[PDB]
Structure 1
């Protein structure tokens, strides 16, 4: 009686589990005793959860909150939801109870599912509740009864909604199109093991899952508890034989500061990928110098398209380089830089706002058509067609070869805090530095800065801190540094 996605129709289930056929006994997951779960064993768990979910009578586009971090079970669940056309709303179990309630209030989901040993208690009787474990999907409270109206699942049905409360609605067509564009850029082979560090609620986690599983590679989820301590993190990457390490730039900060020599011992690491924010070039040069056999890729994009461009950093990074390139749009993606009148910028080195044409475009903001119409706008170079572009909120300029350079959020003398942080990171004893004019440093600095920086770039205040504070998703917490 449940609709199931057909194999020919774009859908995360068929896309991520194709390797269960061509390579059933190859590893889909490596976890830590180092264990592997094969593609066949993963499809078996997905099919079991999907048989259980199908009993609940949910209609296509009924929303399932998945509270978990990246685990074989949580990935088995989101793929079960995918086959049944039930958009998942991934929520980290670290999300505060209040923030979760606010998501439940707006998203009005039919079902909330967490791990057997999950800790969430606060869930209204309108929302069904279930727990999943290699034991199976276990319904605690059934979702409330309904009449199914959707006969067939399509490409534009929602795969997932990302909540930060702003909800980015992504279709199977959009996310599969992104995975296919990256498969074309041979970032990954089937023999790779991708260490993934992002919270499940961050699309960087969904990007890592699909890149691994869509390629026939193994995923190595790094638990936050392993990530937070430098020797522990390095022993986890060594033990699991990780070949690729994905994370926001901050994942390296403790290892660079405390354990650079053990970091150099990661001889199986072939590739590093970051996204989310600028990697401070002094830390990035330090990292590159320790792992000279690891390709480093600058990943640019936003939740609204999942991603835009993948750009290998120069080897070595020029000492004098001020900004890494964010390169060229993925195959099938296109950028217009438009000025403050909405006109194309053709001039080398002049910033405009990125307007992205992407096959991975979000459907809209959940229950916010006004916000949707401000962001997903009529193509300003062809406004009579009804074609839309993403008005990204990001500034960029091109260089002489047409490559892009990120130039900050349009809404956040032009100060480049990156140049302030660079000069400070070049001062004896400073391991980290964030500017917002206040500079915060992890450990005279003022005169060292003034020896090369213009007057408007010299910090008014330089504040010693034990660490750079991070958001749940691992980005610099500038709100937090503001408070103190």
Structure 2
């Protein structure tokens, strides 16, 4: 009857459409590559049918077959024009359907011939939807085809609007072809940028602090031994010092080093630096002078705020201002004119430096403000609260102690490093003064659970792997996670019940967390990946290490968002909470499978009688490694039972081949388990 040209690049040559036309005595030419107007294949062509065609036809060809070029697009046009239509139908939650239409000069904008709605089940995979839409449009083509040939159908224009997507738009969602419609949308909720956005931050910390002083000026803000300062007193004195600092040339983003012990002068010093305009650089005086001289060198601090006692530890490195010299304080008690922006620096804190050299982490005001603004309502902090200034001067945990509670109008209690280690005398101090909320490093926290405490209402911990929950006190227990690079913490979890692996919770305000794979593509919920952080938590980066900064604070290839590569390994749970799964460079090759040893420790320890476990990886010198299971228990446990115990919750390739019983572990000075001090096993 007529010779038809079938254009497609994805579909098989033996699609139902191809055979139905052959059944009607039509010659079907198949062509899966771009074609030009010169090609003689055009001659003796009565109809051009395209179906999943991956090229465009020259405008010279569309003008010669006007009214004779037909295309099958498994979408309910104008929705989901372009590439990967079925997918974007599910992701963007558009109307579902399939359309047979005329081609035109643009992408799937031509007039419609026949249109039919389709439905996708919440349990269908995306592959299922792809195949059902193909199955539906094919059958629709067959039904109305004769109505196409004789052209009796009246073409109608597309509804206004619709969406469009391009070829590469799907690169980010590549790992989801086999995921479910329900599971997919769930991933969209947890990771997609919210359409409705929380207002950005337009305030510096000292702005908000100065507001709090006007509201509760005579409230005690900080207590050290018997001495105390009110919000007004603290504000006026910090103002006096801040004037002297700006007169000495302090300008925004300038660094000012502070070297003091926990005291009132420390709090005055911190606020004075902010108010002047700059960011403060805490230097614990009990550091090796080697580190002190390095922190002072890497930091551009021309000024040093410090004590007569600790003055010399600088070795005349920088200009010194004595917080005990009455001439370092100005006559002016008024707040200074604000010169800062929220993206100016507020503080610079240095990393451990155990692996590599110590990096100076730059944190901006808006980072700190966002956390303190999330902290106040989340934990219901009120002026009636009292918090410990416990963590060290130069750890972001101190930023929590001081700043969160100051903007809530609460009362800070200085902890002398003298009373810091004797947690028993510390508990006595807490119950006496009525301490209600505070952050304690893990272990320091786990120890405090042994003490009978009645004062606390909330204790917050994190930074290490929490493993003990039972506690004497009547207070809620919270566990959170986050690198210093992203301002204190970016997630929090309320420890309601015991867990083999205690989750790290859900993100805080203006923060999103993405579990991505090695290609930086999305992982379905429940699938482990690298934890990426997004939003207002991300600091500026490392000081004087720009290349290194751009390695960790990336511009995502597909998304374009700024994100922090944590190097950590985690996954989302069904209820939305996040679960930490160890570091990423701790991975090793085990029978052709990438595995994190230590991901097994929770399951072992979950067994009733086992109390402490650490699984390691040892090489046989044959380029092959094997897993060894170390566990403390009353007595030996048969290899057949443990292999079966883990088998319930773990694959077979993860189950360790060797198990080692020991009545105890060589705990290091820290109190944790020394991984290397354990015995080795050959095989």
TM-score tier (shorter): 0.7 to 0.9
Asked whether 1:377 is paired with 2:578, we answer no
**Deviation of residue 52 (structure 1)?**
2.6
Structure 2: state its 5+ residue gaps.
1-200, 330-337, 352-357, 587-594, 618-627, 647-654, 679-683
Q: For residue 358 of structure 1, what is the aligned residue in structure 2?
A: 535
TM-score scaled by length of structure 2: 0.58
1:233 alignment partner in structure 2: 426
The equivalent of 1:469 in structure 2 is 670
1:268 to 455, 465, 468: 455
Distance in 2 between residues matched to 1:225 and 1:157, nearest whole Å:
35
1:469, 1:481 within 8 Å by CA — same for their partners in 2?
no
Q: Give deviations 1:311-358, integer Å, cap 9, x for gaps.
A: 1111xx23xx21122222112111111112211011x32111122112
Query: How has the CA–CA distance of structure 1 residues 460 and 121 changed in structure 2, closer, same or farther, with 3 Å as cutoff?
Result: farther
CA drift at 1:168: 0.9
Number of the residue aligned with 1:310: 492
Rg larger in structure: 2
> Which residue is 2:6 aligned to?
none
Q: Pick which of 179-188 and 402-411 moved more.
A: 179-188
Aligned mates of 1:449, 1:370 — CA distance in 2: 52
Contact kept, 8 Å, 2:221 with 2:410, in 1: the verdict is yes
Q: Displacement of 1:171 after TM fit?
A: 1.2
Contact 1:220/1:240 (CA < 8 Å) preserved in 2?
no
State yes or no: 1:123 paired with 2:314. yes
Q: Is residue 46 from structure 1 mapped to residue 238 from structure 2 by the alignment? A: yes
Answering whether residue 596 of structure 2 is matched by residue 414 of structure 1, we say yes
Following the alignment from structure 1 to structure 2, what is the Cα–Cα distance between the partners of residues 423 and 234?
A: 30
Alignment check: 8 A CA contact 1:49 1:137 kept: no
- 1:249-283 CA-to-partner distances (Å, cap 9, x unmatched) read 12134445xxx3xx22x212111101211111xx2
Return the offset for 1:241: 1.6
Deviation at 1:379, TM superposition (A): 2.8
Q: Secondary structure at the match of 1:400?
A: coil
Given the superposition, is the C-alpha separation of residues 456 and 195 from structure 1 closer, same or farther in structure 2, using an over 3 Å criterion?
Answer: farther
- Any unmatched runs of 5+ in structure 1? 1-7, 140-150, 471-475
1:163: Cα distance to partner?
1.4
Q: How far apart are the structure 1 equivalents of 2:433 and 2:494?
A: 25
CA distance in 2, matches of 1:392, 1:87: 25
Q: 2:323 aligns with which of 129, 132, 135?
A: 132
Q: 2:512 aligns with which of 323, 327, 334?
A: 334
What's the offset of the Cα at 1:446?
A: 7.1
> Which among 83, 105, 108 is matched to residue 275 of structure 2?
83
- Looking at structure 1, the residues matched to 253 and 443 of structure 2 have their Cα atoms a distance apart, in angstroms, of 36
Could you tell which deviates more after superposition, 418-427 or 19-28? 418-427
Give secondary structure in 2 for the equivalent of 1:362: coil
**Which residue, 432, 442, 445 being the options, matches 1:252?**
445
1:473 counterpart residue number: none
CA offsets per residue over residues 75-103 of structure 1, 9 Å max, x none?
21111111112211111112110011122
**1:170: how far off?**
1.0
**Correspondence for 2:575 among 359, 381, 401:** 401
Q: Quote the Cα distance in structure 1 between the aligned partners of 2:490 and 2:476.
A: 19
Alignment root-mean-square deviation, CA: 3.3
Q: CA deviation at 1:426?
A: 7.1
Q: 1:268 to 1:478 in 2, by over 3 A?
A: same
Q: Secondary structure at the match of 2:242?
A: helix
Q: Is the 8 A contact 2:376 2:405 kept in 1?
A: no
> With structure 1 as the length reference, what TM-score do the two structures score?
0.80
Higher relative contact order (CA 8 A, sep 6+): 1
Distance 2:246 2:284 in 1: 24
Give the aligned partner of residue 367 of structure 1: 544
Query: In structure 2, what is the Cα distance between the partners aligned to 1:77 and 1:156?
Result: 21
Deviation at 1:361, TM superposition (A): 1.5
Alignment match of 2:345 (pick from 149, 158, 173): 158
SS of 1:344's equivalent in the other structure is coil
How far apart, in 2, do the equivalents of 1:195 and 1:435 lie? 37
Instruction: Report SS of the residue matched to 1:405.
Output: strand
Q: Counterparts of 2:222 and 2:629 in 1: how far apart (Å)?
A: 41
Contact 1:17 1:214 survives alignment (8 Å): no
Following superposition, the deviation at residue 46 of structure 1 comes to: 0.8
Aligned residue for 2:435, secondary structure, equals coil
After TM superposition, the structure 1 = structure 2 runs for residues 430-441 of structure 1, keeping only pairs within 5 Å, are none
